[PDB]
Amino acid sequence: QKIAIVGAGLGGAAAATLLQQAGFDVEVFEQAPAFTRLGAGIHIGPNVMKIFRRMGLEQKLELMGSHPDFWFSRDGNTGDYLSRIPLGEFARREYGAAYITIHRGDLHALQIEAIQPGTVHFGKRLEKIDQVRLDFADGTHTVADIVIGADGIHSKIREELLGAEAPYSGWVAHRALIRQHADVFEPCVKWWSEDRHMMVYYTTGKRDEYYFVTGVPHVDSSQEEMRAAFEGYHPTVQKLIDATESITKWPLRNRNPLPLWSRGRLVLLGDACHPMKPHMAQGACMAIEDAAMLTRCLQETGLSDHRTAFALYEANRKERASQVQSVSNANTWLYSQEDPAWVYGYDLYGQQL
Numbered sequence: 001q002k003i004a005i006v007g008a009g010l011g012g013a014a015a016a017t018l019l020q021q022a023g024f025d026v027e028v029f030e031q032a033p034a035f036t037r038l039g040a041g042i043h044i045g046p047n048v049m050k051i052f053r054r055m056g057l058e059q060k061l062e063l064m065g066s067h068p069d070f071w072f073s074r075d076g077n078t079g080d081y082l083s084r085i086p087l088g089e090f091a092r093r094e095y096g097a098a099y100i101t102i103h104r105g106d107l108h109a110l111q112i113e114a115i116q117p118g119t120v121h122f123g124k125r126l127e128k129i130d131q132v133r134l135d136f137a138d139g140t141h142t143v144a145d146i147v148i149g150a151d152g153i154h155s156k157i158r159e160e161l162l163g164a165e166a167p168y169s170g171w172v173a174h175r176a177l178i179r180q181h182a183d184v185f186e187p188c189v190k191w192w193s194e195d196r197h198m199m200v201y202y203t204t205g206k207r208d209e210y211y212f213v214t215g216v217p218h219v220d221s222s223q224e225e226m227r228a229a230f231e232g233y234h235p236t237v238q239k240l241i242d243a244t245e246s247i248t249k250w251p252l253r254n255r256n257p258l259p260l261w262s263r264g265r266l267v268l269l270g271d272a273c274h275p276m277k278p279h280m281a282q283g284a285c286m287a288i289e290d291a292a293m294l295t296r297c298l299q300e301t302g303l304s305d306h307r308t309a310f311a312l313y314e315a316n317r318k319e320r321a322s323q324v325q326s327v328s329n330a331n332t333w334l335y336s337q338e339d340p341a342w343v344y345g346y347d348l349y350g351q352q353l
């Protein structure tokens with residue numbers, strides 16, 4: 001009995017690792033010709049560190065990541081503190097694991113290196129879908145008993161199931177890494193204004209590398225673009241823009257379709273399953289939660305009963321996914337002094353299936 005995973009992103013690589021460690025036969029097929037360490041940071045909450053704990057990766061991630069004492073929300077124009085969300089040791093004791101911000105590329109490499117060698121295949125772009133046959137752009141094919149669609153917002157699995165999907169992006173994310181101003185650079189801060197924001201944090205425990213990602217109404221960017229976009233923001237933000245060397249700009253969708261969890265022998269996770277706006281910045285975390293829950297369900301039913309496994313998987317994920325959807329719709333996440341326990345203290349492995 002064979003599982004094929006389409007996409008070796010954070011969601012698909014986590015599923016591969018968890019499913020192989022559960023003793024299942026798994027191969028992963030990734031379209032990219034090569035592996036790239038994304039030059040970006042990422043947030044990993046305690047709820048997902050407990051999943052990395054099951055993989056055996058939690059201790060390594062703690063050594064690599066920055067452990068902010070607080071998440072600060074600050075008014076972009078005034079620098080007023082809108083929220084001082086306690087993390088650090090409090091997070092460790094209250095939620096049962098660390099909150100970290102980490103180099104996304106190095107996390108991603110570590111995650112793929114946890115997969116069994118010789119089971120991850122690059123340059124395998126899925127072009128078409130008892131059993132499931134997968135046809136790849138390079139002319140080869142493979143077969144499996146179930147297929148996991150972890151192929152992101154442009155999922156081919158989703159497209160094969162539902163058709164073409166209607167076509168637009170009126171906002172972007174600027175991303176930059178910064179490597180004199182350390183006294184005013186807090187380890188995890190979100191600067192807000194009425195229609196845009198900048199999220200800033202360190203990528204490592206060394207704190208020698210400081211990352212920002214924005215969301216702004218709207219390839220290589222430039223400092224002139226950043227300055228106009230953030231005209232009026234606090235001196236700290238201007239110093240960040242001034243300290244950049246290279247800035248890139250990424251398009252964000254104005255809308256997303258409704259969740260698709262499974263159909264027949266095909267099951268979906270992460271952005272392929274429940275794409276949504278990155279307001280909360282928990283999408284990768286939700287992808288890894290999907291992988292962990294899906295693994296728990298296939299562990300209950302075995303692969304011979306994939307229909308029950310897929311039903312249990314949707315049943316045990318749809319409410320939490322829907323909560324994240326509605327909070328991210330409000331676009332209020334940590335804007336005020338709120339209790340984040342429902343996200344960070346969530347106990348994925350204690351949930352009765």
Ligand SMILES: Cc1cc2nc3c(=O)[nH]c(=O)nc-3n(C[C@H](O)[C@H](O)[C@H](O)COP(=O)(O)OP(=O)(O)OC[C@H]3O[C@@H](n4cnc5c(N)ncnc54)[C@H](O)[C@@H]3O)c2cc1C
Nearest residue numbers: 007009011031043126151152156270271278282283284285
């Ligand atoms: C600005 C922005 C900031 C964010 N910040 C955070 C954060 O701080 N913390 C967090 O948890 N989340 C964050 N997210 C969300 C997160 O990036 C995504 O939710 C996450 O990447 C989804 O993971 P995934 O595995 O489902 O899909 P992806 O990461 O998109 O991976 C999909 C993989 O499948 C491959 N693939 C695609 N199509 C095919 C095909 N036909 N055939 C074969 N392979 C294919 C792809 O090349 C890719 O490698 C952010 C998102 C945005 C836009």
